[PDB]
Amino acid sequence: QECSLQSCTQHQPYVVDDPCPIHFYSKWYIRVGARKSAPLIELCVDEAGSKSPIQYIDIGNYTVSCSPFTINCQEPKLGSLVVRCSFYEDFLEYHDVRVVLDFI
Ligand SMILES: [Ca+2]
Ligand SMILES: [Ca+2]
């Protein structure tokens, strides 16, 4: 699975369905420009055991929450929305799943 198609209300908050299978850890990124060779921008940061959206001056209010991960329902302006799914016993064994949105 390389992409996940999900449905939500355009421009309103949406808890993203995590496509990572059992025994995989999830981390959310934007892949800049949807270009494989480009940087991955991490969307959430852990502080004192809780996760919060990184306040990028540019990204705006795209990330509504990291408890749970919640976006405004739209494609990111800066690139693709990607979750990295990492196997619980081998962090070098992972697969990235791009999330794309249909609108209701
Ligand atoms: Ca990617
Ligand atoms: Ca073993």
Author numbering: 18 to 121
Reproduce the article's own wording on this structure:
ORF8 is a viral immunoglobulin-like (Ig-like) domain protein encoded by the severe acute respiratory syndrome coronavirus 2 (SARS-CoV-2) RNA genome. It tends to evolve rapidly and interfere with immune responses. The full-length SARS-CoV-2 ORF8 is composed of a signal peptide (residues 1-15) and an Ig-like domain (residues 16-121). Herein, we determined the crystal structures of SARS-CoV-2 ORF8 (S84) (one of the epidemic isoforms) and the bat coronavirus RaTG13 ORF8 variant at 1.62 Å and 1.76 Å resolution, respectively.
